[PDB]
Amino acid sequence: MTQAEIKLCSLLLQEHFGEIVEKIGVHLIRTGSQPLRVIAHDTGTSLDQVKKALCVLVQHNLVSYQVHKRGVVEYEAQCSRVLRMLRYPRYIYTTKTLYSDTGELIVEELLLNGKLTMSAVVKKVADRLTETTMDYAEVSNTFVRLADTHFVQRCPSIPDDGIYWQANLDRFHQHFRDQAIVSAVANRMDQTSSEIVRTMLRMSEITTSSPFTQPLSSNEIFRSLPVGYNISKQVLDQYLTLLADDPLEFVGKGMYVINLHKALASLATATLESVVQERFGSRCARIFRLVLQRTFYLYTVNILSAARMLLHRCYKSIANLIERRQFETKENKRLLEKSQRVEAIIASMQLQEIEEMITAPERQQLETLKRNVNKLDASEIQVDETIFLLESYIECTMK
What InterPro entries does the record point to? Predict the structure, then answer.
């Protein structure tokens, strides 16, 4: 919806799917919801290339479709959903964190392969865990836990009416939001204070996420606490300290509430401070801290516009990271092709003379590239962690 995000979508769509898919994808992003003939005409693409490109995009949950007026299907792509391709490593990891390699592989399969039936996922995962015997029933049980906890959901309703599975991104997001609030409350408070916020966020998963938590009572919060030795008097002292606290994650009016917008507001600002410390230094990070709670172009306590433009800078840097990775990998096209071919000979199996095909300076270059690629990969994940926080905060500031 801005050139920064549209350049990013373009890059992702081509890296993952190539020329025509990028062409059709970017088009539906730029020009909006429209039928096949128009896409074909407006893009100067053959009606079958459009048909195929849309199939790949639908398969990958990147393009949705709808029947309007009479029998006329209009295709639509969401710029945001394409940028979520950058968050896939986090979704997959978060799953492993909660469920085993079973959870990890289910979400990896659904995210990377696209639309799959519960059957196709269970089969694909069991085989994958067997090659490292995997009981398909345990795979199926993990899938059911994911679906019950809404981390995984059926695609909206050929027109194959709910027979396919999709990872629920809105669920991973509220989890990331809740995870962040708790961690903030743990690093600035008491851990017993963070656990109280956690259960409060856990039980208020009902009446979320469309500024403030659903009002919760002291009596029910006590009953909903996990299996851990704690008296009602101790907990009541903790809600009271949560109420009267500097970050302002609570207000109450026993009935207690979590100030979700202030929670995101303070997460956003702390992320701004980190950029100040990395770009300007520790001496300059101390100056720009007191101005919060002009030497360099910004305004006194301007929360939104700073985050709103830091997001723009995040989209630009992620786009720069991708371009550099493509550049590094293109400048070594011949060598990594030699590396690929050398790997193929060893797989068919003496071995030492086949390895020798790659010279020591060539292996020094392949390792430097692997190190550099892993470095750019890691930055991309780390920048998206900032993107999530800025986006969430900015989305919450649309009340």
Answer: POLR3C_WHD (IPR055207), RNA_pol_III_RPC82-rel_HTH (IPR013197), RNA_pol_III_Rpc82_C (IPR008806), RPC3 (IPR039748), WH-like_DNA-bd_sf (IPR036388)
